[PDB]
Amino acid sequence: SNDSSDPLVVAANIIGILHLILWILDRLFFK
Amino acid sequence: SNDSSDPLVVAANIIGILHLILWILDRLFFK
Amino acid sequence: SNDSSDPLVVAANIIGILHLILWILDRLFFK
Amino acid sequence: SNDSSDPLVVAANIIGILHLILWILDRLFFK
Numbered sequence: 001s002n003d004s005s006d007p008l009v010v011a012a013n014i015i016g017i018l019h020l021i022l023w024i025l026d027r028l029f030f031k
Numbered sequence: 032s033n034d035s036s037d038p039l040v041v042a043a044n045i046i047g048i049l050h051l052i053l054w055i056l057d058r059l060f061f062k
Numbered sequence: 063s064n065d066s067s068d069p070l071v072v073a074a075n076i077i078g079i080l081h082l083i084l085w086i087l088d089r090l091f092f093k
Numbered sequence: 094s095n096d097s098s099d100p101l102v103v104a105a106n107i108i109g110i111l112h113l114i115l116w117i118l119d120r121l122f123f124k
């Protein structure tokens with residue numbers, strides 16, 4: 001079942017997107 | 032149709048590239 | 063054997079995750 | 094030929110790795 005798509009690929013994309021939420025927030029209060 | 036390639040993979044690459052544009056800009060005015 | 067999954071994909075996810083560990087730590091002592 | 098592996102996937106991993114080289118350098122001179 002994981003042959004079609006591995007959880008690492010899905011998690012990787014999710015992790016990167018989540019990072020943007022936190023990094024973007026910091027950019028909002030940039031100095 | 033999405034079996035060949037999922038939109039998450041394409042979006043992930045696009046999101047990462049876009050992040051660089053914003054992060055790179057900040058690096059330009061580094062201090 | 064690498065046809066099923068290339069090491070680049072696995073390494074890419076690992077590299078991104080590792081980056082978060084270092085970047086997250088910096089955010090902890092943010093100023 | 095690109096069916097086996099798309100250039101976007103390879104480029105994505107390369108782009109992320111390259112980002113670390115620049116981001117890591119900044120961390121070296123952290124303040």
Ligand SMILES: c1csc(-c2cc(C[NH2+][C@]34C[C@H]5C[C@H](C[C@H](C5)C3)C4)no2)c1
Nearest residue numbers: 009012016040043047071074078102109
């Ligand atoms: C489908 C097949 S391979 C495949 C795949 C995903 C990745 C990692 N992508 C990242 C995109 C952004 C966000 C994360 C760090 C890097 C920039 C690389 C995850 N590497 O390969 C997907």
